[PDB]
């Protein structure tokens, strides 16, 4: 209870810091997305190893081809972690959490950009449109999965595609291997590359994924894009806590 509150007050502070930082550096949004994906996609059921554990901060993992071009995003993460650590009442925040939290703020940024765009670039109105729904209420479960532990080393090599050079079947296999499938692959378009339209053109060439891409394209044309937003959150939520046992009392302190 009191811990539920402490945690959420601590999340508010994190979120305002993330959105203002992302606001100063929007060209890193694709990096933050991919950083959250590539930290998570090492999860391997059989050996219960890998997953969303912050391993990706290790130079040994960061120099892997699949992780090319992610230095700048990881600097933003370090900078933001140092700032969050200085105001936390319940200890430093883990890398695994900040990486997934940077992901959430980047997602929100791409939703806000939609609203603004749908309003003839007018930024003041697009903010009101975005605020209207969210789907801020759909972040509920995601917001509860706060308290991930840090890995102390790189995740094993060889479990993450170089998305940019990958065929769609290498791509489906990655989602399948982690318990997902063609629908999650489609809705997580933005995570795969800096150019979602291009990513989605590639994805529509495989008939298993096609109907999902067309569905989400349709949803993104409606003003509210509710099904795109809700489904992304759902699958991202599953992805961000894989291999992780959440400490529901993390970031707690005397009342």
Residue nearest to Ca ion (CB): 55
Q: Does 38 bind Ca ion (CB under 5 A)?
A: no
For residue 184, state whether it binds Ca ion (rule: CB under 5 A).
Answer: no
C-beta closer to Ca ion: residue 53 or 199:
53
DSSP class of residue 253 equals -
Choose between 159 and 183: whose C-beta lies nearer to Ca ion: 159
User: Which residue in 31, 55, 100, 138 binds Ca ion (CB under 5 A)?
Assistant: 55
Contact by Cβ (8 Å): 155, 54: no
| 97 sits near Ca ion (criterion: CB under 5 A) | no
Q: Which stretch binds Ca ion (CB under 5 A): 35-43, 135-143, 192-200, 214-222?
A: 35-43
| CA–CA separation, 30 and 193 (whole Å) | 7
Question: In the complex, what is the shortest distance from the CB of residue 93 to Ca ion, in angstroms, rounded to a whole number?
Answer: 16
C-beta of 150 vs 227, nearer to Ca ion = 150
Q: Which of 22, 39, 99, 183 binds Ca ion (CB under 5 A)?
A: 39
88 neighbors 70 (Cβ within 8 angstroms): no
Closest listed residue to residue 242, CA positions, set 59, 39, 93, 18: 39
- 80-102 as b/e, with b when 16 or more CB fall inside 10 Å? bbeebeeeeeeeebbbbbbbbbb
Binding segment (CB under 5 A) for Ca ion, from list 41-49, 65-73, 167-175, 242-250: 41-49
Under the binding rule (CB under 5 A), the answer on residue 155 touching Ca ion is yes
DSSP alpha helix (H) spans, the chain: 2-24, 29-40, 59-62, 71-85, 95-117, 123-132, 140-144, 168-177, 182-187, 196-203, 210-221, 226-240
Per CB under 5 A, which region of 33-41, 64-72, 140-148, 228-236 contacts Ca ion?
33-41
Q: Which residues bind Ca ion (CB under 5 A)?
A: 39, 42, 53, 55, 155
């Amino acid at each position: 209870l009191n811990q539920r509150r402490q945690r959420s007050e601590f999340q508010s502070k994190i979120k305002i810091l993330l959105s203002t930082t992302i606001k100063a550096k929007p060209e890193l949004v694709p990096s933050l997305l991919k950083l959250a994906l590539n930290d998570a996609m090492t999860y391997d059921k059989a050996t219960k190893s890998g997953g969303a554990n912050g391993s990706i901060r290790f130079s040994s993992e960061l120099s892997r081809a699949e992780n090319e071009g992610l230095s700048d995003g990881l600097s933003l993460i370090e900078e933001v972690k140092k700032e969050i650590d200085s105001i936390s009442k319940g200890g430093p925040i883990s890398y695994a959490d900040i990486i997934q939290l940077a992901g959430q703020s980047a997602v929100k940024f791409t939703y806000l950009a939609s609203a603004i765009r749908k309003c003839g670039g007018n930024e003041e109105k697009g903010n009101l449109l975005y605020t209207a729904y969210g789907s801020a209420g759909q972040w509920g479960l995601f917001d509860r999965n706060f308290g991930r532990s840090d890995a102390t080393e790189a995740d094993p090599e060889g479990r993450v595609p170089q998305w940019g050079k990958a065929t769609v079947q290498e791509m489906k296999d990655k989602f399948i291997a982690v318990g997902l499938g063609p629908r999650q692959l489609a809705v997580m378009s933005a995570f795969l590359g800096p150019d979602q339209a291009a990513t989605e053109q590639l994805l529509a060439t495989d008939p298993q994924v096609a109907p999902w891409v067309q569905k989400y394209q349709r949803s993104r044309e409606t003003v509210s894009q509710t099904d795109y937003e809700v489904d992304l959150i759902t699958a991202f939520t599953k992805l961000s806590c894989l291999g992780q046992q959440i400490n529901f009392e993390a970031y707690t302190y005397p009342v």
